[PDB]
Structures are given as C-alpha cells and as structure tokens.
Amino acid sequence: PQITLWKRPLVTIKIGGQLKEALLDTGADDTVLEEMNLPGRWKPKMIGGIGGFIKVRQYDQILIEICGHKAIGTVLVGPTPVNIIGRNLLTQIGCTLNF
Amino acid sequence: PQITLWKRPLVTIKIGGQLKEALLDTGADDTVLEEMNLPGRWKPKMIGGIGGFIKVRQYDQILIEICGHKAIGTVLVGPTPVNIIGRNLLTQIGCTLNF
Ligand SMILES: CC(C)[C@H](NC(=O)[C@H](C)NC(=O)OCc1ccccc1)C(=O)N[C@@H](Cc1ccccc1)[C@@H](O)[C@H](O)[C@H](Cc1ccccc1)NC(=O)[C@@H](NC(=O)[C@H](C)NC(=O)OCc1ccccc1)C(C)C
Ligand SMILES: O=C(O)c1ccc2cc[nH]c2c1
Secondary structure (H helix, E strand, O other): OEEOOOOOOEEEEEEOOEEEEEEEOOOOOOOEEOOOOOOOOOEEEEEEEOOEEEEEEEEEEEEEEEOOEEEEEEEEEOOOOOOEEOHHHHHHHOOEEEO | OEEOOOOOOEEEEEEOOEEEEEEEOOOOOOOEEOOOOOOOOOEEEEEEEOOEEEEEEEEEEEEEEEOOEEEEEEEEEOOOOOOEEOHHHHHHHOOEEEO
C-alpha cells in the first residue's frame, strides 16, 4: 500500500498467531511490542528513546506478518505504550519512504 | 526520493540559514530538534516516548527546508539525541510509506 501520514501509520500485524496493530516506525531501529510469550529463548536488552530507557526481552528469528507481508527477525517485548515495527522488519517487507 | 530503511533515514534540513540533519520519523507526531535559535519566545509542551515524558519548548510557524522541500509548522526543542522530522512536517512534503 501507500500510506499517507496525516494520522499515525498503524497497521495490522500477526505475531504468535494473534492479530495486533502496530506503528510503522521509520525512527525505530528495533521492533518493540507489548507483553506476549514468543517461542525460543530470550535475552535481556535495554532500549532508549525519548524519556529514557526501558527493559525488554529480545527474541530472535521471530515470524511476523505485516499487512500479510512476511518478515522474520528480532522482536523486543516489554512495557511499551504502543506496538512499534522498526527498521529491522520494515526493510524485510521492502518498505520505503517516498516524496 | 525513494528511501530504503537499512540505515536511519537521515536527511539534510535547513532552518534559519543553518544546515542540519534530521531523521524522517513516521513514529513521531511532532518535530523535535535538540537546538536552534528560533525567534525568541516559546510555549512549554509535554511529549512522550518509550521511556516516559519530557518537557519541550514549542515554536510555531517555523520555516524549514527538508531535502529542498519547503515546509512551515511547529518545531519543538527538546532532549532528543537525534533531530526528528515528525508527521506534522512529513505530510507537508508529501512523504508516504510504501510497500
Ligand atoms: C522505539 C525505539 C526503539 C526508538 N529508539 C531507537 O531506535 C533506539 C535504539 N534508541 C536510541 O538510539 O537511543 C539513544 C539514546 C537514548 C536516550 C538518550 C540518549 C540516546 C525510539 O524511541 N525512537 C524515537 C526517536 C528516537 C530515535 C533515536 C533515539 C531516541 C529517540 C522514535 O522515532 C519513535 O517513533 C517514538 C515511537 C513511540 C511512539 C509512541 C510512544 C512511544 C514511542 N516516537 C516518539 O518518541 C515521539 N512521540 C510521539 O510522537 C507521541 C506519541 N506523541 C506525543 O507526545 O504527542 C503529544 C502529547 C502526548 C501526551 C500528552 C500530551 C501531548 C517523539 C519523538 C515526538
Ligand atoms: O523480563 C525480564 O525479567 C527482564 C529483567 C531485566 C531486564 C533487563 C533488560 N531486560 C530485562 C528483562
């Protein structure tokens, strides 16, 4: 699709077999989602943003669908106020900025 | 341009005869710079991110060029480690996300 930016670019995602919604975020290096269980072993990570740092669990090689488009990569899970799809997954679906 | 997301989408901006660089940020409602010398007065404003909330300095009607595209809008000055072009200005240059 082509998504204009008059409102937040929230889209449907599927992860862990569950439909969620998440922000397509070109200002995020990483993907950070709300609390959920994911397969495999996680490792602790800190991520920083506006306001400071938070503690997350890093899961590698996770399947996610973003508007039906499949990506595999690292998903961070933790107490974020919004589900964020970062560049690590945006690149996998061939997402670009255009003007 | 059509900008891929393998690295941060930093672009040249011009504000008050100063060239800077800033991140094209679809996850930012607002535009936030670390500094400028924006014409005098400002209004306080709160913004939030992943780590919590921060007070910033709001300036209205600021003229900015983003990759040579002229825009006018609100610019916040706040504790961001990276200059951020948010959706309030991305819309003005016709920027979209595409996949
Ligand atoms: C999501 C993270 C993985 C992401 N960070 C990174 O990519 C990394 C790895 N961080 C990194 O490099 O950190 C280095 C660092 C950290 C701390 C100190 C010094 C240096 C990030 O926070 N990125 C932000 C910018 C940034 C980039 C690099 C370093 C630091 C900050 C966004 O682009 C990102 O899009 C977030 C996503 C987000 C949205 C909503 C909630 C939480 C997070 N938006 C924002 O932080 C913006 N906020 C907002 O747009 C919101 C939601 N609105 C808002 O506040 O509106 C007004 C309002 C709200 C509430 C009440 C009243 C008014 C902000 C830049 C303006
Ligand atoms: O999920 C956790 O138990 C946890 C605890 C501490 C840290 C530090 C970074 N990530 C963490 C996750």
